[PDB]
Design a protein around this ligand. Structure first.
Ligand SMILES: [K+]
Ligand SMILES: [K+]
Ligand SMILES: [K+]
Ligand SMILES: [K+]
Ligand SMILES: [K+]
Lengths: 90, 90, 90, 90
């Protein structure tokens, strides 16, 4: 489960990195950062400058938000939870 | 279910597109982009400039956020999930 | 239930409106707008300029986010849902 | 439960405060503010300026969002709810 969500999230982020670095002309790290803060809904950046960028972003959000949060709802629920929970056992 | 949420989400976005293009003077694509990133809570844009725009946005968020996320909670749960899940069966 | 969440959300927004108009010097409508997009996590505005504003915002988010979304999870689930659901009955 | 989430959230915020004040050169209060609005997904600030800041932020979001919202889903569900609910009993 977690491994699958891990991979699916990775692929989604790779696609965004490739897209924004090419169409919005961002350095790869900035393209990855934009993809991440957009899909996690933080959105602490300016918006895309091109219409292609805006259209892709709209579709990218609808298709990737569900997945990204599914992975997060497992990274801290089936991985980070035990680490602390089980450890809270004297 | 999914088809209904699909339509409801579309209508909500059409209303926002019409509103922001008219009152905030945005090109249709920018009005749609603003509507989408606002309802999905990404918010990676400047805020509306007019009071009419601010008031509408407040009401638009409260009435459309629930719906938009309901659609997302189906687009990747009852459509994208099977595609990958069932496919994960050798 | 809905009526209570309605009132609780209103009081929370009134407090934010009063606070930001006074400490950040915003016009009431802008103070309300900031309160709303902050608690719904859209965040499509610049951040507070004063330290008092930043500290209050931190506390305001932690105490009001749960409530605001609880109200939203009722405004479209126990009010908007029936309107469309029941109506989807020929 | 609540006490644990309380502590875990505190530690996460302390780490962010230390990181952003050092690497992004922010005053402690601004570093704390950035950490808070980023993990709660409000994101009403400009993004980090350094690559180190961007990379850390990506990891910080994935590891801290689940926790922060878990705490919020308890601060208003097992603490703020009773205060109002039980009080709604004449
Ligand atoms: K958000
Ligand atoms: K934002
Ligand atoms: K911004
Ligand atoms: K923003
Ligand atoms: K946001």
């Amino acid at each position: 489960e977690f491994q699958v969500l891990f991979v699916l999230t990775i692929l989604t982020l790779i696609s965004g990195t490739i897209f924004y670095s090419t169409v919005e002309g961002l350095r790869p790290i900035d393209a990855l950062y934009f993809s991440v803060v957009t899909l996690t809904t933080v959105g602490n950046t300016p918006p895309p400058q091109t219409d292609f960028g805006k259209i892709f972003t709209i579709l990218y959000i609808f298709i990737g938000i569900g997945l990204v949060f599914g992975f997060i709802h497992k990274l801290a629920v089936n991985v980070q939870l035990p680490s602390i929970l089980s450890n809270l056992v004297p």
